[PDB]
Design a protein around this ligand. Structure first.
Ligand SMILES: O=c1c(NCc2ccccn2)c(-c2ccc(N3CCOCC3)cc2)c1=O
Lengths: 50, 34, 117, 43, 235, 81, 81, 81, 81, 81, 81, 81, 81, 81
């Protein structure tokens, strides 16, 4: 059990680290990527309107 | 530890299966969305 | 921030503010941000310059045998003949890129490398 | 050209090659300035 | 004390011995990869905003295509794209799955899921499949007669003995680089298991992050060296 | 017998960490030389130079910690003992 | 007799890893120095330099990890035991 | 038995501090080379160069001091007695 | 008798592999430094620099392989055993 | 027993100071190479460069002298023994 | 007596090959660094550069191969056996 | 017992001098590389370049000579004898 | 007696010859780097860089060959017995 | 007793010579790198650069030759016999 508890606490620490410092950037980079996809997807549509 | 055994095949087949699923339903689709 | 002064031997072409400037000097590709150490570098024969500034789209310049001087405040590009992307005749660039004359071919290649070609 | 020592930076790849490439350019610029000066004087 | 090997679920069939734990870990990572692939298929769209898995797949495919086109265009090697990508995820998911809190005390430390790359069989399977595949590609492009000739010749003819050996080195290293990186880790996290929990928790966090970093780096290096081998064997 | 094996394991772990320390220190110094030179040439590049730096460090430090592992294997879990 | 061979194998594997770690650390530091310098000189190099860089690392790590493999043979499967 | 173990532990610790000193000295010299060069080209860059410096030195010295701690292990708390 | 010879062979093979790894890792890192710098200066150089590079790498790793071969002649086979 | 422990301590201290000497000499040489290159570049900068140069030399010599103190501990106050 | 001499010869040959491989790998990497840098800076000098390169490598490899010659003599002839 | 202690002291002093010689030679070469480069770049600055040079040398050589001093202590005093 | 002396002589000769190999290989590589770079920058200097080069190599080889001689004096002849 | 001291002295002298040779070769290569680079840059600088060069070599080789004398002391007229 002691080994399990120790490795679980380590996993929790690394999970917190990634969620507080690695998740935010990946999240927002993806956010911007998708937002730009959106913008361009649209463009096409509107230029077809023009 | 460094001597291979039957697992060499057992892994390989599985990898090939993955190499199939990706090569058919992932790779071309993503290329096409591209 | 940086203020990019693209000045030709005949006239000054551009003097607006910029955040980043990229160009192919004879020692390789170089990118300059604010407060870059003073530097003097000869641009390659077909060198193109790309300027990134607040808000406006990236500005691509075809430069003929220019020189780049990073200074404490200004990155000055001294050019013999400089052309913005908006002033490029793409077909003329394509035709000139195959010219026998080395200098004319280099200038055509610079115009293309600006044209996005 | 005569070097004038008036009294009291990086270079790529070296200052000697830049000097060699620039002296012809400087002479071209000075000839251009002379021609422009001559045109203004002619007018 | 630490043990090397000692695979669990080991069985025998068709006259061959199989490491049950390694096969199970490989199957788990394979089914996770297949689940990702099928979720993309179920939720892939070009006319709408992409899904998270769609963004991941697009990014990985774009990267692999960028490496391929910069060395050997897909007009010559279009098949190495579906390969280089899978080799990545198959390895990546294989390594990052070892970051889950699946380690416990037997009193010897044990793990429910141990990284497949820590087994020589997994790395050898991947590396020898890559070896055979790009050698077949080289044979196809240069011919069965010309491919060995250009392999021995290499870039410098008189360095022929240093060429052939390197060609035999490519697979081994390609495997041993992956195995040694992960097998070693399997020992470190076991050694950390000798600490008491209140001292054990911090070293596992530090190493686990390295394991994430190094597993990502090793997947990338393995796939990129595969692409480079294809670029070399396909002229 | 265990005394000889323990002495050999201690010497082996000492060699392991000597090599790991040499590699880690010299690699970190070499990477820091590039980092310092780039930040001197390009003061605004610091933020962008940490990613190439911490990746490089992340490699060499890994090679260090792997050694730190196999020392602990030699010293605390001496194989063949 | 086995104790002497075990101590010798431990010392040999320690030498293997000392050399492997020295090589890995120093070569990775040098490659990262090149990467950091190139990215400082031309920022967009970020994109194109990770291909040659991770090749160099791939070459630097190989000699390391192969040694590590031959360490496991020395330590856990001593050839001459 | 204890004498051989202690001699082996002392040799191991000497190897560890020796490698650690090699790594620390060479890495610190390499980093200070960049520091001195950058401050020579840019006299005012000192302020911005001591942060990347002490970072890299912070890594290199770390590799040193870790070894130091473990060497104390080897010599004072020598495992395997 | 054969125990001493086997231990000496293991130590010798460890020395061989440690030296080979140092040489290979450091030489490959040095060559990759030039490769990365050249690609950073000229992205098109990506194409032409792998021929000089992979010649170097191969010559650098020759010494690693020959050494490796003789290590296989030391631990598996053993002169004088 | 002591004679074995004393010989081990002497070998350990020899490694201690050998590594200290290698690190100190090479790091100081690199720092001085930077200082001399900076002063040739800008001969009026001799006064400015002594501060970074002396900081680097202080770090390198701190490593060297801590190692020389640990050799003294090994030889004159051999741990254990 | 022959066992001790054979173990010493094996260790000596291992040292010889380790040093030879260190020198060969590092020197070949250094020479190939110049080759790659020159070919990147002046593409047309490739053939012009392989002459001074293979000369220098030829020197470096010579140092290696002499050492290999001796290693065989150490392990197969073993003077003083 | 002194035989063992004397042999260990001889090995330790040999290590001390080997490390001191490596450090001295490499550091002196590195410093002289800067001296030659500066005197080539600035022929008239020799006087201003030799002072930093002999300082740098005065450091590395010190590390050498200090080691040499302790070698004598190992070789002639043999503190643990 | 002759067995121990011969084993020690073999180990010492291996150290001599391996160190000479490291020095020769690395020095030759470093000198060849300058040779190749100068020839890259100056086609004509090909003729004139062979004089500074072979002098440097002459030094680098000299230290090597001297070691070789002493290595023979260690192994073929035995100063002790 | 004499055999053990003789073997230790041979090993120590071999370490001395290996270190001296590494230092000499690498330092001479580093100094000749600057010499060749300067003479390539400026061909007329030859006569000017032989004074900074032979000084550096004079230092470098000095460290080498000292190691010879002490080696002889270790090898011929071994202290502590
Ligand atoms: O990884 C890769 C690796 N070598 C790592 C390694 C393995 C064993 C020992 C030491 N290092 C290579 C590699 C590939 C080709 C090559 N050349 C081809 C052209 O002609 C000369 C030889 C040279 C190297 C990897 O790709």
């Amino acid at each position: 059990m002691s080994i399990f508890i120790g490795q679980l606490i380590g996993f929790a620490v690394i999970a917190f680290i990634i969620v507080k410092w690695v998740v935010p950037p990946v999240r927002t980079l993806m956010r911007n990527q998708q937002e730009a996809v959106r913008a361009a997807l649209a463009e096409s549509a509107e230029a077809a309107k023009k | 530890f460094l001597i291979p055994n039957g697992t060499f095949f057992a892994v390989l087949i599985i990898f090939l299966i993955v190499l199939g699923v990706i090569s058919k339903w992932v790779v071309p689709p993503i290329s096409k969305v591209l | 921030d940086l203020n990019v002064e693209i000045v030709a031997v005949e006239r000054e072409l551009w003097s607006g503010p910029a955040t980043f400037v990229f160009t192919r000097t004879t020692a390789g590709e170089i990118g300059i941000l604010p407060r870059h150490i003073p530097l003097v570098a000869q641009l390659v024969d077909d060198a193109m310059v790309r300027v990134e500034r607040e808000g406006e789209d990236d500005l691509r310049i075809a430069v003929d045998g220019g020189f780049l001087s990073v200074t404490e405040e200004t990155v000055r590009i001294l050019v013999e003949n400089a052309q913005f992307e908006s002033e490029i005749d793409a077909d003329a660039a394509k035709e000139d890129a195959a010219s026998d004359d080395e200098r004319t071919a280099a200038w055509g290649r610079a115009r293309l490398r600006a044209l996005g070609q | 050209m005569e070097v004038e020592y008036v009294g009291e930076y990086s270079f790529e790849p070296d200052p000697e090659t830049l000097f060699d490439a620039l002296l012809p350019r400087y002479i071209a610029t000075r000839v251009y300035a002379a021609l422009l000066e001559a045109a203004a004087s002619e007018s | 004390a630490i043990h090397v090997g000692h695979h669990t679920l080991v069985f025998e069939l068709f006259g061959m011995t199989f490491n049950g734990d390694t096969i199970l870990a490989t199957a788990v990572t394979a089914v996770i990869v297949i689940a990702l692939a099928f979720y993309l298929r179920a939720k892939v769209t070009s006319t709408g905003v992409p899904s998270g898995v769609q963004l991941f797949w697009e990014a990985l495919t774009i990267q692999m295509r960028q490496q391929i086109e910069g060395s050997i265009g897909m007009k010559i090697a279009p098949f190495v794209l579906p390969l280089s990508v899978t080799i990545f995820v198959f390895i990546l998911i294989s390594n990052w799955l070892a970051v889950l809190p699946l380690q416990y005390g037997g009193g010897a430390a044990a793990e429910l899921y141990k990284a497949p790359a820590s087994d020589i069989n997994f790395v050898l399977a991947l590396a020898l499949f890559v070896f055979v595949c790009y050698h077949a590609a080289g044979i196809w492009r240069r011919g069965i007669v010309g491919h060995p000739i250009k392999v021995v010749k290499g870039h410098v003819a008189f360095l022929a003995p240093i060429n052939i050996v390197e060609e035999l080195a490519k697979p081994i290293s390609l495997a041993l680089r992956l195995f040694g990186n992960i097998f070693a880790g399997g020992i470190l996290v076991a050694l950390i298991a000798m600490f008491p929990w209140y001292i054990q928790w911090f070293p596992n966090a530090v190493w686990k992050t390295f394991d994430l970093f190094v597993g990502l780096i090793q997947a990338f290096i393995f796939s990129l060296l595969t692409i480079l081998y294809f670029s070399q064997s396909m002229e | 017998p265990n005394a000889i094996i323990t002495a050999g394991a201690l010497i082996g772990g000492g060699l392991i960490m000597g090599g790991g320390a040499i590699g880690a220190g010299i690699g970190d110094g070499i990477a820091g030389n590039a980092l310092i030179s780039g930040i001197a040439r390009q003061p605004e590049a610091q933020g962008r130079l940490f990613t190439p730096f911490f990746i490089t460090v992340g490699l060499v430090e890994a090679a260090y910690f792997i050694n730190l592992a196999f020392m602990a294997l030699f010293v605390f879990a001496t194989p063949g003992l």
